[PDB]
């Protein structure tokens, strides 16, 4: 057989979806040579002097969401792309062709290389996976898309029924922000609906994995 | 494959009609036929890839 | 290309019975013919697999109940005494005797059965090399 | 309340992590196994450098901390490692959600093995040795996450499970390894899908399936 095709903004009218992450601590803080990330428990002077908070700043939320999302069965069936709106407004589009390491050191090194580069490359030297569309996600996304915020405060329903009710030409999108203290309003203006899946508060990795499990049993993905 | 041979055992049941091993063999064959559903069994499946 | 499916199914059932009552050499010689027939005729795989008796985890209980009711009244409609291959109902009867020959003492027959159970990769099976086979030839191949 | 390993009457879900990297060495403070801080420590002791995957246990803990099933106090987390120790945590355990702050928690767990909480009210982490069949109910079933078994639905398998029948699942947190780490302890094998699925992803998918089949 063969794997499914590239699931990105190029795959627009076909069967595809978008997983959207936002309100994470993802920037380039160079320690005074190279480029480093904003860590709470590691740097004490730097984090306190930056102006952020230990409870507020969270750089591993994106790494955890990528670890819980890139290995999804629907992602190996070719149905999801990744859209990331960073704290500095950076919008990143990721195809499911590769899988970032769950090691936050290695994932943070790759993220710092992307932050100092905005350019990733393949081993085969034929498919630069890290694309950057015109920001935000909805400026170059598929022509038929469904936008909804999966909130713990919105109407909690089963993920199988709502996804099965969706058409195969639309692109269901979910916005997740894993703030230790926050609210489901990071991409509220982008979402066209407000739905719930869990009855307890969960991070972006847990909500994303629940959505992936619902999508896997939706159209047998 | 026990269709003719048990019938041959049935022929044994029609040969002397006094042996005891042939009746037990026929009963065992009947029990094996009744326990078996004799439906079907196939496979040959596939999927995508990484 | 003018052969029908009923005659092909009757020939397959006759070959299955012949392989059920023969030595290992005849079964090894007739396995390649069955593989070539399965590759040439896609309907013969219907005699190999039955999709109406399959069960799925993402299915309703009514379909499983209907499948169980259909399988509870399962019979063999093939006639071995029927000389006409078209009149023999070996298309509606599954090829169960192929499963009885899978568990064999020889390893070549087991390898042929394992290759037949999986999907077919190439259409040309090269049956000329495995045509002349006997007990002495198999013993010489195993000992050398 | 919180379902524990002492109550072996009511069914309590047990999630046992298998082959998680928790190795300690001497500097001269005791140092946990790191894959990007110590490189020559693995290459000189006699071990390999691919046996340092310590963030899998913390990832499974954080992924099963704020779960809807863990909010109900039904999921108890057992962990077995190559060192030969087992860890048991109730669903009400609270730890810092940063791996650098969880580095101190890991050092405390590898240096005391009984972490009384910061509130000093309950020891959340309890150290237990072999075996693990005495932590579940007497009527329990053991499921191993392996691709050898056919893929079956979580709701379909959980619907046939009894109310008193406890479920003890085994998740392989190792980046590389076999699924027969507890094959003598596992009863049957289960699957999630034919496509790829991770370990913490499988744990969160099982949590979602238990939420769908048990209203959690």
UniProtKB/Swiss-Prot annotation, chain A:
Binding site for S-adenosyl-L-methionine: 150, 177, 182-184, 197-202
Site (Stabilizes Arg-88): 60
Effect of residue 58 to D: Loss of substrate rRNA binding. No effect on growth
GO CC annotation terms, alphabetical: 90S preribosome; cytoplasm; nuclear microtubule; nuclear periphery; nucleolus; nucleoplasm; nucleus; small-subunit processome
Catalytic reactions on record: pseudouridine(1191) in yeast 18S rRNA + S-adenosyl-L-methionine = N(1)-methylpseudouridine(1191) in yeast 18S rRNA + S-adenosyl-L-homocysteine + H(+)
Bilayer-spanning residue ranges: none
Keywords from the named record: Methyltransferase, Nucleus, Ribonucleoprotein, Ribosome biogenesis, RNA-binding, rRNA processing, rRNA-binding, S-adenosyl-L-methionine, Transferase
Outcome recorded upon mutating residue 60 to G: Loses its exclusive nucleolar localization and mislocalizes to the cytoplasm
Main localisation: nucleus
Enzyme Commission numbers on file: 2.1.1.260
Record PANTHER family: NEP1/MRA1, RIBOSOMAL RNA SMALL SUBUNIT METHYLTRANSFERASE NEP1
Subunit structure: Homodimer. Interacts with snoRNA U3. Interacts with NOP14 and MPP10. Component of the ribosomal small subunit (SSU) processome composed of at least 40 protein subunits and snoRNA U3.
UniProt protein name: Ribosomal RNA small subunit methyltransferase NEP1
UniProt source species: Saccharomyces cerevisiae (strain ATCC 204508 / S288c) (Baker's yeast)
Lineage: Eukaryota, Fungi, Dikarya, Ascomycota, Saccharomycotina
Gene behind the chain: EMG1
Curated annotation (Swiss-Prot), chain B:
Localization terms from the record: Nucleus, Nucleolus
Lineage: superkingdom: Eukaryota
Summary of the function given for this chain in its UniProt record: Involved in nucleolar processing of pre-18S ribosomal RNA. Has a role in the nuclear export of 40S pre-ribosomal subunit to the cytoplasm.
Family indicated by similarity: Belongs to the NOP14 family.
Subunit description: Interacts with snoRNA U3. Interacts with EMG1, MPP10 and NOC4. Component of the ribosomal small subunit (SSU) processome composed of at least 40 protein subunits and snoRNA U3.
Name of the molecule in the record: Nucleolar complex protein 14
Biological source species: Saccharomyces cerevisiae (strain ATCC 204508 / S288c)
Source taxonomy: Eukaryota, Fungi, Dikarya, Ascomycota, Saccharomycotina
Gene that this sequence comes from: NOP14
